[PDB]
Amino acid sequence: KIPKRLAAILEVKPVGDVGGGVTGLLNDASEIVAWTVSAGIKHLMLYDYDGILQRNVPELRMEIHSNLAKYFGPAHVPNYAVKIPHSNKIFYNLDGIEEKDKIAIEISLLSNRDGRETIVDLTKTMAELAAVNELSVSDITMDLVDSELKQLVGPEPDLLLYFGPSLDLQGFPPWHIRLTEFYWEKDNNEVIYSVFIRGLRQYAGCK
Amino acid sequence: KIPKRLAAILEVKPVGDVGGGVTGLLNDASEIVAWTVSAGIKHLMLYDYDGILQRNVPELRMEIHSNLAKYFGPAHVPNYAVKIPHSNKIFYNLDGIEEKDKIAIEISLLSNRDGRETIVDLTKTMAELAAVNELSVSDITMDLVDSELKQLVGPEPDLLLYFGPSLDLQGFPPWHIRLTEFYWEKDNNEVIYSVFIRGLRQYAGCK
Secondary structure, eight states: OOOSEEEEEOOOOOTTSTTOHHHHHHHHHHHHHHHHHHTTOOEEEEEOTTOHHHHOHHHHHHHHHHHHHHHHOTTOOOOEEEEEGGGTEEEETTTTTOOTTOOSEEEEEEOGGGTHHHHHHHHHHHHHHHHTTSSOGGGOOHHHHHHHHHHHTOOOOSEEEEOSSSOOOTTOOOTTOSSOEEEOOTTOOSOOHHHHHHHHHHHHTOO | OOOSEEEEEOOOOOTTSTTOHHHHHHHHHHHHHHHHHHTTOOEEEEEOTTOTGGGGHHHHHHHHHHHHHHHHOTTOOOOEEEEEGGGTEEEETTTTTOOTTOOSEEEEEEOGGGTHHHHHHHHHHHHHHHHTTSSOGGGOOHHHHHHHHHHHTOOOOSEEEEOSSSOBOTTOOOTTOSSOEEEOOTTOOSOOHHHHHHHHHHHHTOO
């Protein structure tokens, strides 16, 4: 039993630390991508509070390709797509940078603006639609808000991994985490494979 | 350093299991109340998805008194209030059942209805007022949503305790948990004092 949809919250760390800074953040993201693909998981959400990932997409796409080549061999890089929901942008493989076209993993990049701020914007949108008589107040339902936020932000993750010592959601979109299970480790302060693996084992039902 | 505001998510167990059912839930709730008062914490949110606690308020109130008498002696039961935000009800001590009037702990009972469905309710309220121009769309802001949900549901908890093995918020009101700290134990599947205490020690920063 593996999650169909995986999420991870990443934190940027001092550049003087080993594997820190923005480059370190992108490397951590690409490690998580390779681990997720290796586990057979086809949907991944990566979140960081300020949107560093969203502002470094070219470098991220190159790091993902490089890391996938390390795990799968340079001739067998799984196909991937990187999506930014709030701009409706999607990027495939290294198209534009550098059957057998099926996407092995789709990676969505999220930040704080995609959470509460997006819900406030949605409430304004629905109020404006009611004020111009295009939406009945009684048609504002859970199903409508659900489907709107699913389109604006994305579907709910089954499991969310956090690699710091104390769970801090730090703005992660709070609507579609009704049943999401969270995993982290009390000591941990680094993005390392053994924590990823223990999180999946916990989700699966191991001891 | 103790949290000023404590939350606990409770799960109901099979009615046939040992310490299960509604009786088991109420005993767990009243234990957490006694432990919280003993630690000096004056604000407690108790959440269960279906609102079982809200449907069993008389018995809960009795159990709280009974359990407090066990911890403090029958002659020194701290004063307590049980509040239900969704219905705007509040009950003091055993009034109506059976300085020296100061409330030692206020216990709020929450359920899934207090979470996303309440955000939908708020969206409908704002949409209706916007539709008759009692509310400008420009005034639908983060500050407004923050204050409305704080009034409808309650303030943000500093620490949230979960007594199952994999943290699942299961509908806990998601807006005002921005900086909330979360605690649970990977092995655990029962409401026991040692998990409560280890959670408070983690929050404090102990070794």
